[PDB]
Symmetry: D2
Subunit: 245 residues, 4 copies
């Protein structure tokens, strides 16, 4: 019973107002965690917390563009204050997406994706390291993507930033193991989110369907539990078999 | 949340369930509400296990089977079908065999043994279980592979090769049987505590060598493999198929 | 040292299994083209004698004997004959001979399984064991296994075939690490679909051909010399720091999405 | 014919960071097979000495000073190469890179921005600028120099390895999107190689030694030859077995 619980744990989830992030918030709360989340949109963030606070859920938030270093430093300080410098769980879920042929990418496109997909997760880990160490039971989960192992038209820079994230998972896993912190990455296939609302792909999925947000969030919760205590440095695809055909 | 993280009402077969990882898997599955069938080659051991599991009112049945034998695998599948009335939700291929020798030392008998017990047993049991898994409407196959199928550990050549074969077979199974709502995945453990016996002396120098290469600096416990096997069989793993997941404390990526 | 030395197989000896057609025949000719003395085999005496007669008329140094590499006694014999011809020194072992059965998983019999394991995996494993003294005595050894790119993806009908080739990919890593001390390197080449006599029935099957070719970014199947060139390169002194790798020769097939 | 497939006669090539280490070996390897090479470096003095060395050995090497971490210098570099080679480039070798060895905690914003610019955005933007001449050559070959540590965790390598992992993924996207233009793209992932950039690591190499620059340059040249015509999208480690040694 204790191996499969997150009771007494504190968690930060970037980009919890919609999509996968929102499902991760609810899954973690469902298992006993206290969650701090963020978004760039005050109104929806605000709405999201009212809902959760109606429902018994200890969720806290503030507006953060995790594409801003200054903002990131800001988020980390507030998180540290709320949780008194102890954090069990960091989920780097917030990201960005640009779909263009390689010829079409601009300098702004490139810096945009690198900042929100790679530099964001990296610096937040740096910022959260003291608090994760203080937890004595740290878990970092990055939301990667399955296209970091295959070539999908238009995904070049986006997949490259996600492939950098997968490697960073390895380095975090080994460097911070001595602080009892585990790091893993979840690589989703196509998931129905507000991000993706914005036949060819599904024809390539053996299950013949796109993913649901809870099919990703459930593994995010699992990787944070005591039952996952020997799983670290892994990249796990949640794609209905999409990458292997 | 409660429906997607439960195995209530499911049926499972776990090969080699008397000790170690296999034993932890059986009890993890029962813990989440499955009815479990298990086997072993040692009858005496198996009976004791069976007699015990009752008294903690766990729903576990079993029979003696050497999974390296084709005819014994067939008889196992028929008894499992009879016990579960032709409906199997879960197949855990955990039984295997280990021999460690320099490449030059392996004989024809070694090669035959390792391939039969590690690769053919899992392949043939998948074929035999396919009708039951399909009749269940929601199937989950988990192979217990090994993280040494991605790196070279001294003495592991044929053993690791059979596990690399299992990892590939996982992908073929995931794609071919998805249409039957069957998922197939592989768990690749690293160094896991070996259950002791009254008569075998464990090589502690070999154990220390592998544990020294784990970032975590410790050996894994059987429950740390069993937990992921149960999760992979839950409704909550519905979009996870064809994967090989290392449970090794960072062993394979530790440079 | 020099570029000309590092890109040459002058003075080497090599064994290529299954050299009478397809990829194996292209490898025999590629290795001869760079100066190697080659030994080869197949199961068919008439075809092998014909190849050997052609290679003499080309003044290529190729020797051969009949060998079914799925048989343990035949492999032992082959290794004794090779060691006699090359005076116990072998620079290069190319495990090219293989076999193929295409069925749904439910369809495979015990004989199908045994056939594929013996010719794709046990043949290579045992021939590496038998060749080890000669590879070490050459002072510079190179083992190349011909695997398959479908040991990383699921192709319908390929379950046992791909699994035996995945076993080869792992064995490559063990051989690379255990025998580095003997100055032997081991690598695997993993082709996508290649035009060979082995695939001729596939190529005639126009629906099966378009299905596979639609998945290759290059829009075509490969040719035997596109595999053989890399087999030759992996055996040269220029490949001195390349060991334990699995290299796909597949026109982008496996990473295409 | 064999002799035709194993050869780079008449090809044109750009190799970034050709004044030392692997890049220097790649320049000489490519010239050795008949290529005409354009290369570059941030250091004018050493670029001069290299160009003068190669001039005195009658190699066809041209060079200009360029910092590939700067967007504008990349565009200037691309236009000079198009002019020298009359708009046709057979070969692009993205070798120039940077290294910063620190624990994850120590990396600064400049360090991160530094490594991404020189290891990732450098190659990516240069690929776009080189695309018309590579297409115009009718036979294009892009080779990135990545690193074998993009598959394992080596202490101090966290950001460096991540940029090389991004390179490895970018190779796959390039290989698939530009196969239609008869351009192939592959990555070489060296282990420890004896260079000016460079017992704990050697004890983990099965061969028990670091590599030589020509042991990387050999493969770079092979991947540009017609013999490599069906090889694209691959990441090939040149590491003496280091990544697989357990
Ligand atoms: N859905 C898929 O198919 C798929 C596949 C592979 C990977 N992924 C990855 O999964 C993660 C989530 O995607 P999703 O599809 O669930 O996205 P989504 O539905 O678009 O939700 C994104 C969430 O992130 C927040 N967010 C976005 N940018 C942010 C920023 N710069 N700072 C702070 N918060 C930010 C968004 O709110 P604001 O805009 O209000 O800030 C929103 O709450 C991403 O890393 C994505 O790359 C998704
Ligand atoms: N072609 C492809 O598309 C493809 C793709 C991936 C991998 N591969 C692999 O590449 C290798 C060569 O294939 P291929 O297409 O070139 O085959 P192929 O055209 O059929 O030629 C095979 C050669 O091997 C010989 N051979 C077969 N079995 C043998 C045995 N048991 N003992 C001795 N010799 C034997 C054959 O001659 P006899 O029959 O007369 O013995 C023939 O010389 C195989 O390992 C194959 O699995 C091929
Ligand atoms: N050697 C290894 O152990 C190893 C291992 C893995 C990967 N690698 C990779 O292999 C590649 C070469 O490494 P190396 O060790 O040969 O490095 P190196 O010896 O330090 O050589 C670097 C070369 O690149 C040039 N260069 C560096 N930054 C540049 C810039 N911004 N613009 C233009 N030129 C630049 C250098 O000249 P200036 O300073 O004059 O610009 C020099 O010519 C790098 O990508 C490295 O990441 C090397
Ligand atoms: N009993 C198998 C030996 C083994 C040890 C450690 C490891 O990571 C994988 C295999
Ligand atoms: N040699 C088996 C034939 C084959 C192999 C691989 C592939 O992708 C397609 C066909």
């Amino acid at each position: 019973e204790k191996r499969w619980s997150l009771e007494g744990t504190t968690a930060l989830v970037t980009g919890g107002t919609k999509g996968i992030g929102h499902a991760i918030v609810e899954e973690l709360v469902g298992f006993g965690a206290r969650v701090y989340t963020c978004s760039r949109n005050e109104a929806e963030l605000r709405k999201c917390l009212q809902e959760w606070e109606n429902l018994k859920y200890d969720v806290t938030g503030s507006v953060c563009d995790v594409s801003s270093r200054t903002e990131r430093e800001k988020l980390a300080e507030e998180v540290s204050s709320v949780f008194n410098g102890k954090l069990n769980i960091l989920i780097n879920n917030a990201g960005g997406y640009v779909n263009k042929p390689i010829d079409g990418f601009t300098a702004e496109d490139f810096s945009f994706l690198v900042a929100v997909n790679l530099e964001s997760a990296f610096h937040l880990c740096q910022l959260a390291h003291p608090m994760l160490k203080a937890s004595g039971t740290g878990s970092i989960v990055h939301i990667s993507s399955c296209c970091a192992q295959i070539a999908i038209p238009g995904h070049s820079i986006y997949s490259s930033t996600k492939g950098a994230i997968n490697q960073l998972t390895r380095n975090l896993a080994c460097e911070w193991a001595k602080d009892n912190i585990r790091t893993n990455s979840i690589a989703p296939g196509a998931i129905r989110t507000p991000g993706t609302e914005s036949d060819r792909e599904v024809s390539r999925v053996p299950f013949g369907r796109i993913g649901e947000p809870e099919e990703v969030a459930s593994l995010a919760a699992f990787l944070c539990m005591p039952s996952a205590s020997y799983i670290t440095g892994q990249v796990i695809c949640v794609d209905g078999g999409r990458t292997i055909n």
